[PDB]
Design a protein around this ligand. Structure first.
Ligand SMILES: Nc1nc2c(ncn2[C@@H]2O[C@H](COP(=O)(O)OP(=O)(O)O)[C@@H](O)[C@H]2O)c(=O)[nH]1
Ligand SMILES: [Mg+2]
Length: 165
């Protein structure tokens, strides 16, 4: 059993907790804002039996006892913005820079996640986020914590990025 420590970061309100809860507990956080838990789930991924630790961090606008500790321990990161929140997408760069600083490494397993892809209108274009992720050298995956679309894709891609590291 290999343990994978995955950290979800991003600005407030983008769906960090919704995504984590959707993956671990298979239901949609229709406003249940936890106040930065940690989660574990045993799952078989690509024939490997894994223990996933999901560390759900708070945005930099909010008090957080554990975000710095969660970030130092994490092996891979989901960098999450909401496709209807332009500031959240602009904040991605700070979040990535800080991950690189805490891990003391430029080659940290990461996935850029554009969440809320269920929505009818958006202010951040896929092409933008794909170009930014390309410049970072990481995958871009669009997700919906509401519909569960792409959620396992995001988290498992992170796991496979950790395996390649
Ligand atoms: N429509 C839609 N709403 C979402 C999605 N993910 C989160 N939300 C909503 O966005 C708000 C903030 O979600 P939350 O998980 O607490 O974001 P966090 O602050 O980053 O942890 C909540 O009201 C959620 O119901 C999504 O994929 N689609
Ligand atoms: Mg949250």
């Amino acid at each position: 059993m290999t343990e994978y420590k995955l950290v979800v970061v991003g600005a407030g309100d983008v769906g960090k907790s919704a995504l984590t809860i959707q993956l671990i507990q298979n239901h949609f956080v229709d406003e249940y804002d936890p106040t930065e838990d940690s989660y574990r789930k045993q799952v078989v991924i690509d024939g490997e039996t894994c223990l996933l630790d999901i560390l759900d961090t708070a945005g930099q606008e909010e008090y957080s006892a554990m975000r710095d500790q969660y970030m130092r321990t994490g092996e891979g990161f989901l960098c999450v913005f909401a496709i209807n929140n332009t500031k959240s997408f602009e904040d991605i760069h700070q979040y990535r820079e800080q991950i690189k600083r805490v891990k003391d490494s430029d080659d940290v397993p990461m996935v850029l996640v554009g969440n809320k892809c269920d929505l009818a209108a958006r202010t951040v274009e896929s092409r933008q986020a794909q170009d930014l992720a390309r410049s970072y050298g990481i995958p871009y995956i669009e997700t919906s914590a509401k519909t569960r679309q792409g959620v396992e894709d995001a988290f498992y891609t992170l796991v496979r990025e950790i395996r390649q590291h």
